């Protein structure tokens, strides 16, 4: 078998586990449709945001 | 109150008793699951939360 | 502004670590557990 | 080429490959296999025919 | 005359009770049942005395 | 919840914790078979790479007190039953008599610091502790 | 003022904490209306439950 | 009926430790938090 | 007074007391309890579903 | 063939999944449930004979 060579495990000491993430945001509202984010593999920086 | 009155009166008073011995053979043969079961005990849980 | 927000005093939401603000929580810290005594 | 781990899917339905990534940090893998309980054995016998 | 109690418990519950709260609680169930039997006898002795 | 704080034994545990940490810090690793020959009996714990939670004590509790312990219970009781039998009692009494002796105006089993040591001051203190 | 002489603290070094508790029960269903608490301080044992 | 029971797979309930069985949970074993990479 | 052993009946229904005598022997008791079997545990599982 | 084409199309995706505890826990009529037998497996040994 290909056991777990290609996966994470994070072995359990509970029937359930949780994972938290931080998202850098911008545009004065962290929770909104259309809110923007600073770090994302497929998106450029909003140069005109801090700019003109 | 009425019950207490009858108890004081000696008309109706506290009692508890074990089961007739015929169950001794019936139950050894259960010895768990059956048509004449032993009743059950266990526990549940509780929890509270407090905002600071 | 980056804010904490708050809970709705909904025990469910508190238990779940969910407030109205910027960040969610892991969950409430354990303050111990209470069991009743057994009579003598 | 010394670059990608090579694994064979012996049950592949037709013919394909999948390429992917796992980082040094277990938390970053995409797929999270997080076992809690494994191979708890059971054993006994049937009270009516005693088959194990 | 007899007196007897059933525990009627599962598996996963204990696995989690231990992982989460530090208690297997099979022992606790045992405790509860045995405790209840003794409590009951204590009362039978007292109650029969008061009766008589 | 019922964390194994063992506050009444914890001050001893502190010594064990330091020794354990050395087992991790030290390079006694890269050992095919699991380093042991004779001693305490192992039980599984989560164990996956760094999975060493306090629950490990609890997993050890779960998987024990039945296997091993029942055997132990039988052996000890057997040994006592043998001990109380004729000539078993003698064989042990004589073995013990020879193994542990007392005599008028003599010493008893004692620490013998006649090989090189760091200091005679320390040796004196070791003798005091031995007593 | 009398600060906290008769009050517990449970310091909450983290806000919004939680506390647990557990009731022992009897009647084959820990989560049910009518289930009874085995050790409730105001009530006696149901001696008949395990007896005749 | 000492039943483990389960979650409804409703994240809210999972997070809050709410199940259909005898006991509730403390919380779902937090496994850390993800940060995004900062580009070069 | 150094003379009577006083106990609390926590389940008195109204308010009462009972005074009695117990001698140094078991025959001089008034009330008897010859247990013969007591608090004997049962352990196993039902392999049909293999629950404890 | 048609299924394979649909699979290539992305219409149908290979999947596997485990069981809720709430289901697995009460298999084989446990705790009053029913019509829920465990899946099970065994083996069969065949024989062949030759002529010298």
What's the per-residue H, E or C state across H1-40? CECCCCCCCCHHHHHCCCCCCCCCCCCCCEEEEECCCCCC
Query: Do the Cβ atoms of H18 and C17 come within 8 Å?
Result: no
H or E segment to which residue E46 belongs: helix E26-51
Q: Which residue from E7, E15, E20 is facing H2, i.e. has the nearest CB?
A: E7
H2 CA: distance to closest CA in chain A (Å): 17
- E3, G49 contact by CB (below 8 A): no
Return d(Cα H19, Cα H5) in angstroms, integer: 6
The answer to whether residue G10 neighbours chain H at the CB level (below 8 Å) is: no
Chain H residues touching B45 at Cβ < 8 A: 22-24
Return d(Cα B27, Cα A34) in angstroms, integer: 69
Chain G residues touching H24 at Cβ < 8 A: 20
Pairing of strands H30-34, A18-21: parallel
Write the DSSP symbol of residue I51: B
- Taking the CA of residue H40 as centre, how many other CA atoms within 13 Å lie in the half-sphere pointing to its CB? 0
The answer to whether residue E19 neighbours chain A at the CB level (below 8 Å) is: yes
Query: Do the Cβ atoms of H23 and E17 come within 8 Å?
Result: yes
How crowded is residue E5: how many other Cβ atoms within 10 Å of its Cβ? Answer: 20
> Which residue of chain C has the CA closest to F3?
C32
Cα separations in angstroms, D38 against F44, F75, F105, F112, I50: 12, 32, 65, 54, 16
Return d(Cα J11, Cα J3) in angstroms, integer: 9
The answer to whether residue A47 neighbours chain D at the CB level (below 8 Å) is: no
Q: Measured in Å, how far apart are chain F's first and last C-alpha atoms?
A: 43
D28 CA: distance to closest CA in chain H (Å): 8
Pairing of strands B41-43, G36-37: unpaired
Q: Tell which of C16, C28, C38 to mutate to test the B interface (max B CBs under 10 Å).
A: C28
Give the three-state DSSP class for A21: strand
- E22, F1 contact by CB (below 8 A): yes
- F127, F113 contact by CB (below 8 A): yes
Q: Which residue from G16, G17, G21 is facing C34, i.e. has the nearest CB?
A: G21
Helices (H), chain F: 10-25, 55-62, 69-83, 88-99, 120-130
Tokens of J46: 């065949």
The answer to whether residue A20 neighbours chain C at the CB level (below 8 Å) is: yes
Cα separations in angstroms, H21 against C14, C24, G14, H25, J21: 21, 27, 29, 11, 10
Write the DSSP symbol of residue C32: E
- B46, E14 contact by CB (below 8 A): no
Backbone angles phi, psi at C34, to 5 degrees: -115, 130
The answer to whether residue H37 neighbours chain D at the CB level (below 8 Å) is: no
Chain E residues touching I7 at Cβ < 8 A: none
> Which of 11-40 (B) contact I at CB < 8 A?
14, 31-33
A–G contact (≥3 CB pairs within 8 Å)? no
Give the three-state DSSP class for C13: helix
Residues 6+ apart with CB under 8 A from H31: A10, A17, A18, A19, D27
F4 CA: distance to closest CA in chain C (Å): 13
Pairing of strands A18-21, B46-50: unpaired
Cα separations in angstroms, I47 against C1, G26, I51: 61, 25, 7
Please, what's the b/e burial string for D15-28 (b: 16 or more CB within 10 A of its CB; e: otherwise)?
eeeeeeebeeebee
Q: Which residue from B40, B43, B47 is facing H22, i.e. has the nearest CB?
A: B43
> Which residue of chain D has the CA closest to H33?
D27
> Which residue of chain A has the CA closest to F49?
A11
User: How many interface pairs between A and E have CB atoms less than 8 angstroms apart?
Assistant: 9
CA A14 to chain centre: 24
Please, what's the b/e burial string for B11-27 (b: 16 or more CB within 10 A of its CB; e: otherwise)?
eeebebebbeeebeeeb
H or E segment to which residue B27 belongs: helix B23-28
- Is the peptide bond between F62 and the residue preceding it cis, with omega within 30 degrees of 0? no
Q: Tell which of D13, D34, D44, D51 to mutate to test the J interface (max J CBs under 10 Å).
A: D13
E52 CA: distance to closest CA in chain D (Å): 46
Q: Which residue from E21, E32, E43 is facing G38, i.e. has the nearest CB?
A: E32
> What pairs with residue B41 in β-bridges?
G26
Q: Which residue from C33, C38, C39 is facing E21, i.e. has the nearest CB?
A: C33
Return d(Cα I44, Cα I51) in angstroms, integer: 9
- J12, J6 contact by CB (below 8 A): yes
Method for this entry: cryo-EM
Return d(Cα I45, Cα I50) in angstroms, integer: 6
Return d(Cα I52, Cα I46) in angstroms, integer: 7
């Amino acid at each position: 078998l290909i056991a777990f060579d290609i996966c994470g495990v994070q072995p359990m000491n509970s029937p359930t586990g949780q994972v938290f993430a931080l998202r850098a945001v911008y545009g004065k509202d962290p929770v909104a449709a259309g809110a923007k984010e600073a770090f994302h593999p497929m998106y450029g920086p909003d140069a005109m945001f801090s700019g003109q | 109150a009425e019950i207490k009155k009858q108890m004081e009166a000696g008309a109706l008073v506290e009692i508890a008793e074990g089961m007739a011995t015929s169950i001794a053979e019936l139950q050894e043969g259960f010895n768990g699951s059956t048509d004449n079961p032993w009743n059950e005990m266990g526990f549940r849980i509780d929890k509270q939360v407090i905002e600071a | 502004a980056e804010i904490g927000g708050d809970h709705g005093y909904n025990a469910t939401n508190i238990a779940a670590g969910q407030t109205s603000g910027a960040v969610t929580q892991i969950g409430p810290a354990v303050m111990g557990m209470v069991r009743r005594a057994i009579p003598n | 080429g010394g670059k990608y781990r090579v694994y064979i899917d012996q049950y592949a339905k037709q013919d394909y490959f999948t390429v992917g990534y796992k980082g040094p940090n277990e938390m970053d893998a995409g797929i999270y296999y997080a076992p809690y309980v494994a191979l708890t054995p059971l054993r006994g016998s049937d009270p009516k025919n005693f088959q194990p | 005359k007899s007196r007897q109690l059933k525990a009627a418990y599962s598996i996963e519950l204990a696995q989690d009770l231990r992982a989460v709260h530090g208690m297997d609680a099979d022992a606790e169930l045992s405790g509860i049942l045995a405790t209840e039997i003794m409590l009951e006898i204590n009362r039978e002795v007292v109650d029969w005395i008061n009766y008589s | 919840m019922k964390f194994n704080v063992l506050s009444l034994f914890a001050p001893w545990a502190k010594m064990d914790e330091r020794n354990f940490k050395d087992q991790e810090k030290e390079d006694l690793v890269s050992i095919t078979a699991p380093k042991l020959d004779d001693g305490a009996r192992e039980f599984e714990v989560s164990s996956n790479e760094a999975a060493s939670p306090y629950n490990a004590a609890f997993q050890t509790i779960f998987g024990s007190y039945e296997p091993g312990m029942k055997t132990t219970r039988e052996l000890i009781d057997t040994y006592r039953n043998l001990m109380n039998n004729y000539e078993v009692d003698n064989a042990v009494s004589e073995i013990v008599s020879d193994a542990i002796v007392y005599e008028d105006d003599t010493e008893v089993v004692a620490l013998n610091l006649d090989k090189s040591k760091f200091s005679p001051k320390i040796k004196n203190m070791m003798l005091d502790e031995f007593s």
